[PDB]
């Protein structure tokens, strides 16, 4: 049963949430290989754990940069949530630690690269290809939302493809455990629900609107609302007038009209039947939900993998030396990390 599987998942989560793991490794236990991605307050590097020979993706955050960007609380949420969750489609946090300068989150290495890279190169995915990925996100949000977690950063850039061709959700920087409504303006312009733009209090229905944006982007090759400037993207979103490519099936357009619904009393995922309104939709009629969860469905695309520690599915980034100050920075702010 789904209700029973989720009940037990919540028990497992709560024990780790109330007693978080802390200081599980040290920088010196890892050989730094290559940068896999960069952001405003750090980078992600492919690393090799010497004691086991295992490869991992180490997220390095500069504490001083986190403080300047007012992302202290968001970073504590990310680590506390990640160490407590357990789901087939979530990138696993293996270790975490900090030093005088940085915070470190050592994740499982997902070699297939970002969905973003594959989507842009290929152009667009077929409806069955998009459906296979969308089903994984449906189950992930069903899991997260049951734990009172809002994800708030769904986009192809944050979705990694594993060796089996299945999705791994990364970037929990905006994830938050919240029972009521929340107000923080956060996310990515193209993916923001109108409630967020309009400075209203919002809830988990924003993740379902973001799913609508993702499915549209995967199947069309471009998002439903784009422009050169974020202000212009916000104007398009609040009108909520969406045009669909002529190649979109009738079932797809109907699912998207229900997900990209400006009216919260009408948005799929937000109704009395919750996620079931999505799982039971016509566009998902061929989806075997249990088989997706169990990873027994054959993936439409398998990434090329030349060997362990191969990075060819990731773009190249300029390397910067990791400097660890002789003085502790922002100790008080990150005490719980």
């Amino acid at each position: 049963s789904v209700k029973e599987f989720l009940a037990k998942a919540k028990e497992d989560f709560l024990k780790k949430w109330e007693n978080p793991a802390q200081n599980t490794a040290h920088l010196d236990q890892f050989e730094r290989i290559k940068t896999l991605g960069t952001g405003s307050f750090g980078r992600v590097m492919l690393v090799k754990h010497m004691e086991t020979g295992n490869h991992y993706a180490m997220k390095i955050l500069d504490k001083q940069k986190v403080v300047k960007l007012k992302q202290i609380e968001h970073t504590l949420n990310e680590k506390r949530i990640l160490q407590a969750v357990n789901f087939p489609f979530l990138v696993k946090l293996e270790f975490s630690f900090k030093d005088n300068s940085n915070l470190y989150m050592v994740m499982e290495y997902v070699p297939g690269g970002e969905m973003f890279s594959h989507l842009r190169r290929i152009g667009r995915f077929s409806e069955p290809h998009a459906r296979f990925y969308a089903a994984q996100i449906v189950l992930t949000f069903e899991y997260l939302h049951s734990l009172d977690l809002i994800y708030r950063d769904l986009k192809p850039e944050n979705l990694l493809i594993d060796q089996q061709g299945y999705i791994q959700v990364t970037d929990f920087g905006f994830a938050k455990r919240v029972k009521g409504r929340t107000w923080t303006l956060c996310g990515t312009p193209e993916y923001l629900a109108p409630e967020i733009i309009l400075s209203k209090g919002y809830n988990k229905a924003v993740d379902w609107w973001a799913l609508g944006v993702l499915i549209y982007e995967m199947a069309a090759g471009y998002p439903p609302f784009f422009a050169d400037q974020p202000i212009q993207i916000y104007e398009k979103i609040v009108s909520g007038k969406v045009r669909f490519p002529s190649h979109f099936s009738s079932d797809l357009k109907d699912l998207l009209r229900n997900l990209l619904q400006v009216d919260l009393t009408k948005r799929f995922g937000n109704l009395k039947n919750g996620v079931n309104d999505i799982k039971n939709h016509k566009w998902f009629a061929t989806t075997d939900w249990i088989a997706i969860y169990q990873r027994k469905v054959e993936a439409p695309f398998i990434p090329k993998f030349k060997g362990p520690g191969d990075t060819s599915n990731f773009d190249d980034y300029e390397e910067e030396e990791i400097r660890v100050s002789i003085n502790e920075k922002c100790g008080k702010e990150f005490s719980e990390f």
């Binding site: 960007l69 842009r120 920087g173 923080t184 956060c186 990515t188 312009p189 090759g221 471009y222 050169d228």
Partner: peptide, 20 residues
């Protein structure tokens, strides 16, 4: 076409998150 308009836009690269 919408595809040509997208490809010609400044938003085909990795999109940064917004906050505050």
């Amino acid at each position: 076409t919408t595809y040509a308009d997208f490809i010609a836009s400044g938003r085909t690269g990795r999109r940064n998150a917004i906050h505050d």
